[PDB]
Design a protein around this ligand. Structure first.
Ligand SMILES: Nc1ncnc2c1ncn2[C@@H]1O[C@H](COP(=O)(O)OP(=O)(O)NP(=O)(O)O)[C@@H](O)[C@H]1O
Ligand SMILES: Nc1ncnc2c1ncn2[C@@H]1O[C@H](COP(=O)(O)OP(=O)(O)NP(=O)(O)O)[C@@H](O)[C@H]1O
Ligand SMILES: [Mg+2]
Ligand SMILES: [Mg+2]
Lengths: 145, 146
């Protein structure tokens, strides 16, 4: 069954990703909390003026910010975001099984899927524990290959 | 079934919650919203289950429930969590002997991250575990190891 596991490890991010939710690094913390409710997501990807990834924000980053303090309306997200270069990213060509291992091992809910352009990391997707959950359901209904 | 993938499917469909749950994190319903946000960080979970005096489930709190409370234009951080929690009877729960893939479908269909695993008692549901999308991710990882 090593061969079966092998074939599973060849499934790629492009076929199982979700749209990215992105915010500009100068948007306020209040604005980022709004986007996360309007978009109903749990992780936000922060980009610069040239649309290049610079940061991520999670719910707890925002909840940490929201006690107290600290004028959420006046505070730019770049002040609190988790910053590049310490963001775990993937590309559409990566194998979802490797990306599941990063979500686990890095203890995070989502990766940005980026494309390496002649500008930097442009954000083109997200892959989360929801996408993983769905792939697992699909496997159990023999709906993949 | 007749292919390796069908055999895969067949196993997946027989996994039970009791073998793939995590420890539950529970708070009393009189704890303040600030205290619940403290617990969430202290315990490193994204969903807290709320119980009453008799350790029976009465509610759940998610990260966004607490974020909404902390930034809303009413002062809600000082209030008891029972003011803001999602309340019974409208909690999706599971039991130890439920099938994991049935739970994964509810997580997806109901767009929530976690269910409490409960046991029925004569006073109501006792919280005895949690199953979340993190659990499901770990099962997916094990497939490529095993
Ligand atoms: N892809 C990522 N790469 C690097 N850091 C990340 C990434 N995703 C989130 N983070 C940071 O990692 C921390 C954990 O985020 P995440 O876990 O996804 O959400 P959380 O709401 O903060 N809690 P949790 O689910 O318990 O880990 C936060 O400080 C994030 O900003
Ligand atoms: N098991 C459950 N049964 C009923 N409601 C739940 C359950 N788990 C969470 N909820 C509620 O459903 C809403 C969405 O929860 P959940 O999704 O888990 O987290 P959020 O951080 O609020 N993010 P999201 O994953 O994007 O909807 C919140 O009001 C929760 O209180
Ligand atoms: Mg997150
Ligand atoms: Mg949450």
């Amino acid at each position: 069954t090593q061969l079966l596991a092998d074939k599973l490890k060849k499934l790629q991010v492009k076929d199982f990703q979700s749209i990215p939710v992105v915010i500009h690094e100068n948007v306020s913390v209040y604005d980022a909390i709004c986007t996360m409710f309007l978009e109903d997501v749990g992780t936000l990807f922060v980009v610069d003026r040239d649309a290049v990834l610079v940061g991520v924000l999670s719910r707890k980053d925002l909840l940490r910010a929201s006690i107290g303090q600290q004028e959420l309306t006046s505070v730019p997200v770049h002040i609190i975001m988790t910053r590049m270069p310490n963001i775990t990213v993937c590309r559409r060509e990566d194998y979802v099984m490797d990306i599941a291992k990063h979500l686990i091992e890095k203890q995070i809910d989502a990766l940005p899927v980026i494309k390496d352009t002649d500008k930097g990391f442009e954000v083109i997707g997200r892959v989360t524990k929801t996408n993983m959950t769905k792939i697992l359901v699909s496997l159990s209904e023999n709906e993949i290959l």
